[PDB]
Design a protein around this ligand. Structure first.
Ligand SMILES: [Zn+2]
Length: 258
């Protein structure tokens, strides 16, 4: 009876196994655009993905994750609110059963159809496992998805999902360029928060882009054909794998733009 997104093990239950669920810097949060302060010290976000090396895509039982070779400085995030260099390790999404919900962060209470997380770890901690034990261990770049025109750069991801339908399935996924998932503007909000799946560690500097990317209805529909369950088990569609907004508590969200 482990954590999940069902009726008996979903986000409202997680605190029982992971008490930090009720912590002081939990994510996601609602971004109140009128309360976020423009910060004239925030540098432009530097995203250097030209040498990114994807390896594999995995159905991990709550989402799918595209993993990268992070053994060299190849795909790095720096600048913005960050000190130092953070290396890309994986990206994954959160999505809904319907276009009207699916994002984890919300903007003035608005829910998007999905949310992309590009997860990076602080190179000063040597690897991901050590980084998540530190308050500044991770930087996660969050990008909202809305349903409209197709995102061509996403299609290679959508087309491989049939091969990883059920929990535990993985597939070779090389030469995928995550630059094809970025919106035009890198304007962002930033605040200190946490992983949004257990163990919910409070190790993340969140950088959430203001500009959503558009994906097609057909693209998001294919996300919804994935399964939470393993092969040979009763079918449960992988939908609504998003944690709802958590109390902001003692935190200020800063904006890179006015
Ligand atoms: Zn996530």
């Amino acid at each position: 009876h482990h954590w999940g997104f069902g009726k008996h093990n979903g986000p409202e239950h997680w605190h029982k196994d992971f008490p930090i669920a009720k912590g002081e810097r939990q994510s996601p949060v609602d971004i109140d655009t009128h309360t976020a302060k423009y910060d004239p010290s925030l540098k432009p976000l530097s995203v250097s993905y030209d040498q990114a090396t994807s390896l594999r895509i995995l159905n991990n039982g709550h989402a799918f994750q595209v993993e990268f070779d992070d053994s060299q400085d190849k795909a790095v995030l720096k600048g913005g609110p960050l000190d130092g260099t953070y290396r890309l390790i994986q990206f994954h999404f959160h999505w809904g059963s319907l276009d009207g919900q699916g994002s984890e962060h919300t903007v003035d209470k608005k829910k998007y159809a999905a949310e992309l997380h590009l997860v990076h770890w602080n190179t000063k901690y040597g690897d991901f496992g050590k980084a998540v034990q530190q308050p500044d261990g991770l930087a996660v770049l969050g990008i909202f998805l809305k349903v409209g025109s197709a995102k061509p750069g996403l299609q290679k991801v959508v087309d491989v999902l049939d091969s990883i339908k059920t929990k535990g399935k993985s597939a070779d996924f090389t030469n995928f360029d995550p630059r094809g998932l970025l919106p035009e503007s890198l304007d962002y909000w930033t605040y200190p928060g946490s992983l949004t799946t257990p163990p919910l560690l409070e190790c993340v500097t969140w950088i959430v882009l203001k500009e959503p990317i558009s994906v097609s209805s057909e693209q998001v529909l294919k996300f919804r054909k994935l399964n939470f369950n393993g092969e040979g088990e009763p079918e449960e569609l992988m939908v609504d794998n998003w944690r709802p907004a958590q109390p902001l508590k003692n935190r200020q969200i800063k904006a890179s733009f006015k």
